[PDB]
């Protein structure tokens, strides 16, 4: 293309995603094509040829459509984002004077499954399972901890924190989970 824009987009699982075809509206478009390359699947397209008003789709059963709009804007829509929607979304606009391309690296935000519990010998476990990206785990009060981060095949990350407190005056502890989808302070009785 004569101008290529590459960007990353993060959208929360289950939400609706709207992607603009280019950084600016392009008036003299003769052809608009979205090429969707999903993780482990053949590519499909949604296209619009301007002169004949010929709309196209080879994305049946992929839940990817043009956005519904009165002015027929070349915006792509994902009505309910699944982890499977991760991939490259490329919009190609042909104008008489040149090609414009916008490539989206679409990333899905996944709230972690949080489990927390006391363990034997004044210990506590706090785990943020299969979050995307990794959650962060901190504690109140600070303890002697071992925290691991395990990434899975799906791209989600399990963060597991196991602590012990050598201050016998401490009876209640709080696990603080931070994530792009949400944050929470979680109490544990030792
Ligand atoms: C932009 O993204 C495309 C598709 O993901 C890639 O092929 C291309 O190399 C990237 N451009 C640059 C300048 O890195
Ligand atoms: C293609 O058709 C859909 C409805 O099936 C419409 O929402 C969309 O605007 C059309 N595409 C373009 C760019 O006109
Ligand atoms: C991978 O992702 C799914 C969500 O799509 C999650 O529920 C699951 O726990 C993850 N897989 C493993 C083996 O952890």
Residue numbers in the entry: 15 to 204
Quote the study that presented this structure, word for word.
CD200R and CD200RLa contain typical Ig-like domains consisting of an NH2-terminal V-like domain followed by a smaller C2-like domain. The first NH2-terminal residue for which electron density was observed is P15 in CD200R and Q18 for CD200RLa. Superposition of the V-like domains (residues 17–126) of CD200R alone and in complex with CD200 supports the earlier suggestion that the NH2-terminal region of CD200R is flexible; a rotation of the main chain around residue 17 results in residues 15-16 moving from the front GFC face (which would impede binding to CD200) to the back BED face, exposing the CD200 binding face. Conformational differences between the bound and unbound CD200R are seen in the BC loop (residues 37–41), DE loop (residues 82–87), and to a lesser extent in the EF loop (residues 93–94). These loops are not involved in the interaction with CD200, and these differences are due to the different packing of the molecules within the crystals and also reflect the plasticity of these loops.
CD200 is a widely distributed membrane glycoprotein that regulates myeloid cell activity through its interaction with an inhibitory receptor (CD200R).
